[PDB]
Design a protein around this ligand. Sequence first.
Ligand code: MG
Ligand code: MG
Ligand code: MG
Ligand code: MG
Ligand code: MG
Ligand code: MG
Ligand code: MG
Ligand code: MG
Ligand code: MG
Ligand code: MG
Ligand code: MG
Ligand code: MG
Ligand code: MG
Ligand code: MG
Ligand code: MG
Ligand code: MG
Ligand code: MG
Ligand code: MG
Ligand code: MG
Ligand code: MG
Ligand code: MG
Ligand code: MG
Ligand code: MG
Ligand code: MG
Ligand code: MG
Ligand code: MG
Ligand code: MG
Ligand code: MG
Ligand code: MG
Ligand code: MG
Ligand code: MG
Ligand code: MG
Ligand code: MG
Ligand code: MG
Ligand code: MG
Ligand code: MG
Ligand code: MG
Ligand code: MG
Ligand code: MG
Ligand code: MG
Ligand code: MG
Ligand code: MG
Ligand code: MG
Ligand code: MG
Ligand code: MG
Ligand code: MG
Ligand code: MG
Ligand code: MG
Ligand code: MG
Ligand code: MG
Ligand code: MG
Ligand code: MG
Ligand code: MG
Ligand code: MG
Ligand code: MG
Ligand code: MG
Ligand code: MG
Ligand code: MG
Ligand code: MG
Ligand code: MG
Ligand code: MG
Ligand code: MG
Ligand code: MG
Ligand code: MG
Ligand code: MG
Ligand code: MG
Ligand code: MG
Ligand code: MG
Ligand code: MG
Ligand code: MG
Ligand code: MG
Ligand code: MG
Ligand code: MG
Ligand code: MG
Ligand code: MG
Ligand code: MG
Ligand code: MG
Ligand code: MG
Ligand code: MG
Ligand code: MG
Ligand code: MG
Ligand code: MG
Ligand code: MG
Ligand code: MG
Ligand code: MG
Ligand code: MG
Ligand code: MG
Ligand code: MG
Ligand code: MG
Ligand code: MG
Ligand code: MG
Ligand code: MG
Ligand code: MG
Ligand code: MG
Ligand code: MG
Ligand code: MG
Ligand code: MG
Ligand code: MG
Ligand code: MG
Ligand code: MG
Ligand code: MG
Ligand code: MG
Ligand code: MG
Ligand code: MG
Ligand code: MG
Ligand code: MG
Ligand code: MG
Ligand code: MG
Lengths: 197, 111, 156, 106, 127, 122
Amino acid sequence: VEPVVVIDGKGHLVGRLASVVAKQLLNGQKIVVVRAEELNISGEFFRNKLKYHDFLRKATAFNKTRGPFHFRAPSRIFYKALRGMVSHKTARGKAALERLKVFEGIPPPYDKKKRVVVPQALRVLRLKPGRKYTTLGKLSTSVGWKYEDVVAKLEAKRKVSSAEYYAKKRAFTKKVASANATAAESDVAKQLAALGY
Amino acid sequence: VAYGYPSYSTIRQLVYKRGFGKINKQRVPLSDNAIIEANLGKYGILSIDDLIHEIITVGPHFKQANNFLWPFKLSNPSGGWGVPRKFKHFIQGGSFGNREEFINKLVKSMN
Amino acid sequence: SAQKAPKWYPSEDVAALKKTRKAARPQKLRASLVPGTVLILLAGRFRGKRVVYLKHLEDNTLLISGPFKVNGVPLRRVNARYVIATSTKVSVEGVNVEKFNVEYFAKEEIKAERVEDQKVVDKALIAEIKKTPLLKQYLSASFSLKNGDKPHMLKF
Amino acid sequence: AESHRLYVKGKHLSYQRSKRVNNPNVSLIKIEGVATPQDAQFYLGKRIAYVYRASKEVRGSKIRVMWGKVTRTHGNSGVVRATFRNNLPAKTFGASVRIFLYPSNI
Amino acid sequence: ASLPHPKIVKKHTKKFKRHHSDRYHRVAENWRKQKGIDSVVRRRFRGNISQPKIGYGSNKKTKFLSPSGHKTFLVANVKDLETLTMHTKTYAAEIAHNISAKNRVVILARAKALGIKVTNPKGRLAL
Amino acid sequence: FNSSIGRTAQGKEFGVTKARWPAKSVKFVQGLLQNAAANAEAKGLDATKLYVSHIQVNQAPKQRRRTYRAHGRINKYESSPSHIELVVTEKEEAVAKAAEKKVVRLTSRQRGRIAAQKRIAA
RNA sequence: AAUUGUUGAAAGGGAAGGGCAUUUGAUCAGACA
RNA sequence: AAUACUGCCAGCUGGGACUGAGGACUGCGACGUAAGUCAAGGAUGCUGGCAUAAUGGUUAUAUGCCGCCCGUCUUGAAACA
RNA sequence: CCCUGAAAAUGGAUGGCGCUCAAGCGUGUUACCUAUACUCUACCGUCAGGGUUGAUAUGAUGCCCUGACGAGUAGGCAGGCGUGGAGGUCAGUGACGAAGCCUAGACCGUAAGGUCGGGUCGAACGGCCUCUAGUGCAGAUCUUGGUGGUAGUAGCAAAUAU
RNA sequence: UUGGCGGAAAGGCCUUGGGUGCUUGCUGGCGAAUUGCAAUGUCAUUUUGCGUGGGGAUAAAUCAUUUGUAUACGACUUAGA
Ligand SMILES: [Mg+2]
Ligand SMILES: [Mg+2]
Ligand SMILES: [Mg+2]
Ligand SMILES: [Mg+2]
Ligand SMILES: [Mg+2]
Ligand SMILES: [Mg+2]
Ligand SMILES: [Mg+2]
Ligand SMILES: [Mg+2]
Ligand SMILES: [Mg+2]
Ligand SMILES: [Mg+2]
Ligand SMILES: [Mg+2]
Ligand SMILES: [Mg+2]
Ligand SMILES: [Mg+2]
Ligand SMILES: [Mg+2]
Ligand SMILES: [Mg+2]
Ligand SMILES: [Mg+2]
Ligand SMILES: [Mg+2]
Ligand SMILES: [Mg+2]
Ligand SMILES: [Mg+2]
Ligand SMILES: [Mg+2]
Ligand SMILES: [Mg+2]
Ligand SMILES: [Mg+2]
Ligand SMILES: [Mg+2]
Ligand SMILES: [Mg+2]
Ligand SMILES: [Mg+2]
Ligand SMILES: [Mg+2]
Ligand SMILES: [Mg+2]
Ligand SMILES: [Mg+2]
Ligand SMILES: [Mg+2]
Ligand SMILES: [Mg+2]
Ligand SMILES: [Mg+2]
Ligand SMILES: [Mg+2]
Ligand SMILES: [Mg+2]
Ligand SMILES: [Mg+2]
Ligand SMILES: [Mg+2]
Ligand SMILES: [Mg+2]
Ligand SMILES: [Mg+2]
Ligand SMILES: [Mg+2]
Ligand SMILES: [Mg+2]
Ligand SMILES: [Mg+2]
Ligand SMILES: [Mg+2]
Ligand SMILES: [Mg+2]
Ligand SMILES: [Mg+2]
Ligand SMILES: [Mg+2]
Ligand SMILES: [Mg+2]
Ligand SMILES: [Mg+2]
Ligand SMILES: [Mg+2]
Ligand SMILES: [Mg+2]
Ligand SMILES: [Mg+2]
Ligand SMILES: [Mg+2]
Ligand SMILES: [Mg+2]
Ligand SMILES: [Mg+2]
Ligand SMILES: [Mg+2]
Ligand SMILES: [Mg+2]
Ligand SMILES: [Mg+2]
Ligand SMILES: [Mg+2]
Ligand SMILES: [Mg+2]
Ligand SMILES: [Mg+2]
Ligand SMILES: [Mg+2]
Ligand SMILES: [Mg+2]
Ligand SMILES: [Mg+2]
Ligand SMILES: [Mg+2]
Ligand SMILES: [Mg+2]
Ligand SMILES: [Mg+2]
Ligand SMILES: [Mg+2]
Ligand SMILES: [Mg+2]
Ligand SMILES: [Mg+2]
Ligand SMILES: [Mg+2]
Ligand SMILES: [Mg+2]
Ligand SMILES: [Mg+2]
Ligand SMILES: [Mg+2]
Ligand SMILES: [Mg+2]
Ligand SMILES: [Mg+2]
Ligand SMILES: [Mg+2]
Ligand SMILES: [Mg+2]
Ligand SMILES: [Mg+2]
Ligand SMILES: [Mg+2]
Ligand SMILES: [Mg+2]
Ligand SMILES: [Mg+2]
Ligand SMILES: [Mg+2]
Ligand SMILES: [Mg+2]
Ligand SMILES: [Mg+2]
Ligand SMILES: [Mg+2]
Ligand SMILES: [Mg+2]
Ligand SMILES: [Mg+2]
Ligand SMILES: [Mg+2]
Ligand SMILES: [Mg+2]
Ligand SMILES: [Mg+2]
Ligand SMILES: [Mg+2]
Ligand SMILES: [Mg+2]
Ligand SMILES: [Mg+2]
Ligand SMILES: [Mg+2]
Ligand SMILES: [Mg+2]
Ligand SMILES: [Mg+2]
Ligand SMILES: [Mg+2]
Ligand SMILES: [Mg+2]
Ligand SMILES: [Mg+2]
Ligand SMILES: [Mg+2]
Ligand SMILES: [Mg+2]
Ligand SMILES: [Mg+2]
Ligand SMILES: [Mg+2]
Ligand SMILES: [Mg+2]
Ligand SMILES: [Mg+2]
Ligand SMILES: [Mg+2]
Ligand SMILES: [Mg+2]
Ligand SMILES: [Mg+2]
Ligand SMILES: [Mg+2]
Ligand SMILES: [Mg+2]
């Protein structure tokens, strides 16, 4: 439907975002996910910290290099959830994964692009209220992810340059909204009114 | 098995559509009324409906009339079975046993 | 010999076909196809062209016209199944169209008869097109699907 | 003007398959904006084309088309099964495909 | 010019090659049936090669017809060639592989003048 | 035929670590090289352009000799003689063009667009 | 024949080879009239 | 009174898919005042494209899914037989 | 239902990812996906039941109609394929090229196999009805011969020395 | 072309001024056929290659030799107009 779909990761439940992102991929849809550090996980922080440590202890005994690899960054945590839902050793699986990019914060290009949201993985719509959950950047930091402060710093700055963007924009739609008002009551206008516009 | 009470409508549409005759074995399609009279005219019964009448009413010659009919070969129910698992009794939410006049909806989908 | 030779040869006498039972009965048209309806040509040379429906020809085709002065389509044959009949409609009750048969379009540049026949039909049409505003422009636009158009949804 | 499309956009999903055996004789087509079975019974019978490019020119073009037809609906979400003059090449899984408007009935 | 025949349908055009003919040189492709007790092929496990069987048998009506529509007949000399004199829409003559250069020009020419088809007409031709 | 051979910087020239200095092979090849030079001298071939165009080695019949192994045993101790052939050739530039002409064949709908593209425009 | 050199073509992210299917490349029969 | 529900109609009717075996006639019927006609013991009519590597066969490669070494003895073998 | 009771050795398995008003547990209603099964059709074979010697063309173990059926080790039987030699025959093929060998070239058969093209080749050889056996190989730590990977590797260092 | 912003991967965003094309805002003149009743009917963007001429630029690494802060061999670290 669109060449690329930028997903604001914030507020989505990991495996559910991973699951729709996975299918989209395999159906030809390019996808980049942003703000992976504001991702959510059901269950409280401690459970998912433990869970991560369970994962953390598995490795090839005779050579901890060949064994499993434990990536700390919230994007890569997410990628792991996601690659688990793709036949990633097939060619078609590698095909589909190249159509995917995960990101902490919202870096260039995609910060000027509009990002969308996935209702069926939105935590605020999914989780029963009163349930406990986990933020991915908090989880990632407790297991050796370095860059939580640098990301929040760059994001706070980016949000500042964006609040201006919006502000200028809302100011201009006030003109357009005012323009369209005087054009209302005219002949074009009541005709379009008729045709549903 | 699943069985029940056939209605005239489903006996009619069974004989008409998938009704065949054992004639020197040779499972013969019923297609013409003269096929029947040749083999069942002995006992009355000289039309395809003369058959259905003998069947549905259980006449004096239901043995020879009913045996003249080859077993009916039905397909699987066209909308499915309705139950999740088949090999329980109808009463217990499966398909087998005597489901009485509910046999007609079953059979009509299998025809 | 190198090969023996068969005991039986199949006779080369060629049989004749059984007497088939297939009458060519006439083709009834879908109710949306009435003369003077605006079609959308879905495929072929003039694809996406909006065009006026005139006569149902004996070979099952449909007689259309641009009109040629509106959008460049001539009096032409078109297959009823490669067409969307719209709901918009001019009155064709002053168009000859009788002249036009299958043999008319035998293959056998443009015959002067056709160039004229085009003008006589067209003039009648235009005179009626002009009766509803913007219709003449519509008939010179091409139809295309825009983003979001859902054919199984759109009233035509 | 800018648009010219006379088809509905499509996507070649999978072959028809079980868990562990596919059937290359039936492709499964995802039609843009068709989301239920009832919506997709409109497209039954429409012709599909998978257009693709090639290096060897042929009949004076470097562009080739495999033609098919929607034949039946699939599942509950407006997926649709379709068959082609030659099965689609399984690399096409996730490629774009063109569902036309003919044989029309409007 | 062959007699009319129903669309020739072949049923399994892929050569039935012997199991493991692809594996050891010693094992020729010529079909051989597996007699082993565990052999996946004999047991018909899903994924392995298929085996000859009578279901594959060609339609009686079109069996032995090569493309054109003519059952082929091996021809060694004119008298052999002439046996197809009343049968040109049913049989094509194939010249035997050992017929000499000159002798094939006689058969070809006689075949031409009789309306009999020939399947390998460029053999030993003096081009 | 290079496994467990040593490494040398001299392989770098060729992207290689394992290279060697087989003097009896060299001395035999340049022997036959020399002969092909002469043969082209007498042919009148412009020696200034000669390049080695085909040079192949495969194996002459082996030569049995035997050595003596522990507990009273015998083992083959063979030679691996070779068959060498090479041909030099006067290098030469270009090749010119010239080929088919590509039979273009297009349906009636496919010549109409062509004719109209020129009827319409250039 | 195993096996080897050269030349040509092609594939190769912890073997190779096989089945059904199709794209692409190469190659070829027959049939039109 | 209506509606639902369940059942019936030898009531009407649209969209889609696969198939077209057979090769004179012969049968059982149907429509017709009639002559004739027919959807009644298996596809015909009309139009177009190419006449070619277009379709098809072979082959090599890629891709989806699938595929453990054969032989043997054995209750049981891919077996660390 | 959940928690405690609940301790093992390479890292690790509700099949995996992951899931928390579930993608968990109980239970109900629908729709949906797909077996070599089921229904209909085409073809192949097997078995069965019919019909047909009437000349003046070509199979009577034939030809025509019809129905049903088709898993298989050990094992039985059947009908076929291929080799060496023998009787008969085709007044068969051949130095204007027999036999053989090569060939991701063509065709026939379900298959054993059969046929052809080309290339190499150089003196013989085949079809059909019969007869006959020292008549078909992947195996037997099979027999004899030939050849690989190993591998330019182990190694070529005792006896003082050039 | 004026001024300004953007380093998270900025490599893009904003603003000034003239030049020029288009304008379906509205009203006109001309054209379209025969591509024959459909046959994607070809309008994307990848990399490379060959000559033409409008700017711009004129190295190094390796073998060999050598050091010994290094070394089984490669490799490492030095030196040499
Ligand atoms: Mg895919
Ligand atoms: Mg894609
Ligand atoms: Mg590992
Ligand atoms: Mg994974
Ligand atoms: Mg993919
Ligand atoms: Mg909620
Ligand atoms: Mg339903
Ligand atoms: Mg269904
Ligand atoms: Mg069911
Ligand atoms: Mg169940
Ligand atoms: Mg049914
Ligand atoms: Mg008739
Ligand atoms: Mg009608
Ligand atoms: Mg109607
Ligand atoms: Mg116009
Ligand atoms: Mg797939
Ligand atoms: Mg499926
Ligand atoms: Mg196909
Ligand atoms: Mg794929
Ligand atoms: Mg075959
Ligand atoms: Mg065997
Ligand atoms: Mg096995
Ligand atoms: Mg066993
Ligand atoms: Mg001769
Ligand atoms: Mg020859
Ligand atoms: Mg080696
Ligand atoms: Mg070494
Ligand atoms: Mg080594
Ligand atoms: Mg060593
Ligand atoms: Mg090397
Ligand atoms: Mg020794
Ligand atoms: Mg000794
Ligand atoms: Mg050796
Ligand atoms: Mg044009
Ligand atoms: Mg033009
Ligand atoms: Mg590896
Ligand atoms: Mg293949
Ligand atoms: Mg002809
Ligand atoms: Mg009701
Ligand atoms: Mg009814
Ligand atoms: Mg027919
Ligand atoms: Mg037929
Ligand atoms: Mg009457
Ligand atoms: Mg009729
Ligand atoms: Mg061709
Ligand atoms: Mg041509
Ligand atoms: Mg082809
Ligand atoms: Mg040809
Ligand atoms: Mg062509
Ligand atoms: Mg074609
Ligand atoms: Mg190749
Ligand atoms: Mg292959
Ligand atoms: Mg597998
Ligand atoms: Mg084996
Ligand atoms: Mg035991
Ligand atoms: Mg046993
Ligand atoms: Mg066991
Ligand atoms: Mg075994
Ligand atoms: Mg074991
Ligand atoms: Mg509970
Ligand atoms: Mg372990
Ligand atoms: Mg558990
Ligand atoms: Mg779950
Ligand atoms: Mg599960
Ligand atoms: Mg539940
Ligand atoms: Mg329902
Ligand atoms: Mg099954
Ligand atoms: Mg089956
Ligand atoms: Mg059946
Ligand atoms: Mg008999
Ligand atoms: Mg059996
Ligand atoms: Mg046999
Ligand atoms: Mg024999
Ligand atoms: Mg013999
Ligand atoms: Mg020989
Ligand atoms: Mg060769
Ligand atoms: Mg070959
Ligand atoms: Mg041939
Ligand atoms: Mg072959
Ligand atoms: Mg043949
Ligand atoms: Mg040959
Ligand atoms: Mg030859
Ligand atoms: Mg020879
Ligand atoms: Mg001699
Ligand atoms: Mg003989
Ligand atoms: Mg014998
Ligand atoms: Mg013996
Ligand atoms: Mg064997
Ligand atoms: Mg054998
Ligand atoms: Mg032998
Ligand atoms: Mg052997
Ligand atoms: Mg062996
Ligand atoms: Mg054996
Ligand atoms: Mg051996
Ligand atoms: Mg060796
Ligand atoms: Mg040496
Ligand atoms: Mg050594
Ligand atoms: Mg020693
Ligand atoms: Mg010494
Ligand atoms: Mg001394
Ligand atoms: Mg930066
Ligand atoms: Mg980026
Ligand atoms: Mg930058
Ligand atoms: Mg301007
Ligand atoms: Mg415009
Ligand atoms: Mg174009
Ligand atoms: Mg230059
Ligand atoms: Mg100097």
